[PDB]
Design a protein around this ligand. Structure first.
Ligand SMILES: [Zn+2]
Ligand SMILES: [Zn+2]
Ligand SMILES: [Zn+2]
Ligand SMILES: [Zn+2]
Length: 118
DNA sequence: GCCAACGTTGGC
DNA sequence: GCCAACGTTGGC
């Protein structure tokens, strides 16, 4: 389950109080049953939750411990759009096999195992 | 514990 | 085929 980034112009904009979802909020005098965010606050690049860890080694992102961009990528968590697996690419045992990175979402790709199947 | 809100589905 | 409603997760 992804969480809003809290840093995009969408995230930092206040609730309009006039859209369909704001109108449902108790704070704006609604029943509070829809439980959805303001329609003007839809995060552009949602992030993995703080507690996300690699399926294989059980650790979180360690990309700050490495300098090079390839090394950093391998120590970062990547979530597969297809199999939903969150893993460090360096924790995978597929040599040359490359996935397909999604640039619209952070830590998002179609993993090397799925691209090969597909 | 409070509260915001993601992802999915049955009922229309 | 849509969407209100809900269970339940995530940040604080
Ligand atoms: Zn709104
Ligand atoms: Zn955002
Ligand atoms: Zn790992
Ligand atoms: Zn996959």
């Amino acid at each position: 389950r992804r969480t809003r980034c809290r840093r995009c112009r969408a995230c930092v904009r206040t609730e309009c109080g006039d859209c369909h979802f704001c109108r449902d909020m108790k704070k704006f005098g609604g029943p509070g049953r829809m439980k959805q965010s303001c329609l003007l606050r839809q995060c552009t690049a949602p992030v993995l939750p703080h507690t996300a860890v690699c399926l294989l080694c059980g650790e979180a992102g360690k990309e700050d411990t490495v300098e090079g961009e390839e090394e950093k990528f391998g120590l970062s968590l990547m979530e597969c759009t297809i199999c939903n697996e969150i893993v460090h690419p360096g924790c995978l045992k597929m040599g040359k096999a490359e996935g397909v990175i999604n640039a619209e979402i952070p830590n998002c790709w179609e993993c090397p195992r799925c691209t090969q199947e597909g």
